[PDB]
Amino acid sequence: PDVKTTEINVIVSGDEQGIITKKLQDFCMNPNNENGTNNQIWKCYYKDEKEDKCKVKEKITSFDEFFDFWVRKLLIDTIKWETELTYCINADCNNECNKNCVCFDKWVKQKEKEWKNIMDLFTNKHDIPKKYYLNINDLFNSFFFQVIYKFNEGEAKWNKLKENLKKKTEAAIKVLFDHLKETATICKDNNT
Amino acid sequence: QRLHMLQISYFRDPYHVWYQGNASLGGHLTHVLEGPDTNTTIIQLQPLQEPESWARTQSGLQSYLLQFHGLVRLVHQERTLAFPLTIRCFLGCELPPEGSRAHVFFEVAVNGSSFVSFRPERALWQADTSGVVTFTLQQLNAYNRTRYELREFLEDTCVQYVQKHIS
Ligand SMILES: CCCCCCCCCCCCCCCCCCCC(=O)O[C@H](COC(=O)CCCCCCCCCCCCCC)COP(=O)(O)OCCN
Ligand SMILES: *[C@@H]1O[C@H](CO)[C@@H](O[C@@H]2O[C@H](CO)[C@@H](O[C@H]3O[C@H](CO)[C@@H](O)[C@H](O)[C@@H]3O)[C@H](O)[C@H]2NC(C)=O)[C@H](O)[C@H]1NC(C)=O
Ligand SMILES: *[C@@H]1O[C@H](CO)[C@@H](O[C@@H]2O[C@H](CO)[C@@H](O)[C@H](O)[C@H]2NC(C)=O)[C@H](O)[C@H]1NC(C)=O
Ligand SMILES: *[C@@H]1O[C@H](CO)[C@@H](O)[C@H](O)[C@H]1NC(C)=O
Ligand SMILES: *[C@@H]1O[C@H](CO)[C@@H](O)[C@H](O)[C@H]1NC(C)=O
């Protein structure tokens, strides 16, 4: 109770070039799993920002290292999903576009579970370090180069995401989750 | 006359940085910057800019710090950097007496050795001396932010500041 402990099962797309739906293919057919090509079991320990740990093959990282990876990959996958679902943005015959949409909604829910598990490491909302609870401007400045790198016309997609979070509603990740949840709502309704 | 800006960034590891910097209007120390990545304090030693204008400038400088750190983290993630390391940014604008165009610069050093620098003519970054260098240049030369917006900060924002606060 000095040191808070949590288990975070991270659904990793892959640090590869390609359609989000093919790497998360193994995750789309198989949702909740201890196995699967996309499973990544993390165990985190948090005391201070001076002393914190995370562990997974058996790699042990700092919380900052894990969290940078997690936020960076959350933002990359969101953009990859959005570009893929753009064509999925009303009536069909058990559509691929509908299957993509079903996996995205499942994926958003998985990411919310990952985020809430990460939040368990913090006793109260009033005192969660600024470092891990950044606003829209801060988060989009901090991850500009890291996210943008993965994409052709990356600077434009990043600006589009920032304006859409700015339209929505506070911490950028909650606003992002509201935006993802909404994308899945629109997507499912316009597909079924 | 001139506005020079200096920023030293001490990286213990990829995720923690201590900033230490300053700015001067021709010899005279005008600004100081210091603190960890999350809580960097930026001050104008004299009230040169009024509250509203200073708050806007501070916001730009804080956005810059977050972006800068991000770029270092990216180079490490992609190419591997050897920690601890220090990065120095030395930049500014100089207005010649009977000289139409202001002279501008932005030079980056790593662990005390020249690394990359900005060329305002075509708004491109070049090596000042290689996986790390090549990757860093690719990134800096890829975006409007690091090319054109940067040139406008140096040639437009910086120059106007000198004309307003010295004159
Ligand atoms: C009014 C005058 C203003 C001055 C205020 C006075 C205070 C002086 C204090 C001195 C201390 C600060 C020293 C840092 C200087 C950087 C200045 C930031 C530049 C800047 O404002 O440009 C922004 C973009 O920055 C970018 O271009 C972001 C890209 C960052 C990349 C920089 C390259 C370095 C990376 C090298 C590392 C390599 C590592 C690899 C191993 C956009 O400005 P805005 O929002 O104001 O414009 C609104 C107009 N529409
Ligand atoms: C910038 O200068 C740094 C000066 O400290 C330098 O770090 C030093 O060099 C290496 C990293 O490449 C470290 O590794 C050595 O020590 C460890 C034990 O700590 C040994 O296991 C290794 O075999 C090796 O001999 C040094 O420890 C480190 N010095 C200190 C005081 O920590 C960076 O490499 C430089 N970075 C760049 C990018 O130029
Ligand atoms: C990105 O860059 C180009 C410039 O290469 C932008 O076009 C204009 O060009 C000048 C430089 O010659 C810029 O300084 C201006 O900001 C741009 N003009 C206008 C009217 O905006 C282009 O618009 C940029 N694109 C995006 C999406 O940022
Ligand atoms: C600006 O900072 C550097 C180190 O942070 C220092 O060596 C230099 O003397 C400073 N400038 C002034 C005018 O004190
Ligand atoms: C920010 O850092 C400075 C030293 O760099 C320190 O004096 C100040 O108290 C810090 N701010 C907060 C909110 O603690």
Author numbering:
A (entry chain A): 497 to 552, 562 to 594, 599 to 678, 691 to 713
B (entry chain B): 9 to 137, 141 to 178
Which lines from the publication concern this structure?
The PfEMP1 family of surface proteins is central for Plasmodium falciparum virulence and must retain the ability to bind to host receptors while also diversifying to aid immune evasion. The interaction between CIDRα1 domains of PfEMP1 and endothelial protein C receptor (EPCR) is associated with severe childhood malaria. We combine crystal structures of CIDRα1:EPCR complexes with analysis of 885 CIDRα1 sequences, showing that the EPCR-binding surfaces of CIDRα1 domains are conserved in shape and bonding potential, despite dramatic sequence diversity. Additionally, these domains mimic features of the natural EPCR ligand and can block this ligand interaction.
A second complex, containing IT4var07 CIDRα1.4:EPCR complex also crystallized, and crystals diffracted to 2.9Å resolution. Despite a sequence identity of 78.5% compared to the HB3var03 CIDRα1 domain, this complex crystallized in a different space group and with different crystal packing. The structure was determined using HB3var03 CIDRα1 and EPCR as separate search models in molecular replacement. HB3var03 and IT4var07 CIDRα1 are extremely similar (rmsd = ∼0.3Å), but despite differences in space groups and crystal packing, both CIDRα1 domains bind to EPCR using the equivalent surface. The two CIDRα1 domains are built around a long three-helical core bundle. On one side of this bundle lies a four-stranded β sheet. Indeed, comparison of the structures of the CIDRα1:EPCR complexes with that of EPCR bound to the Gla domain of activated protein C (Oganesyan et al., 2002) reveals significant overlap, with both protein C and CIDRα1 domains interacting with the same region of the hydrophobic groove of EPCR.
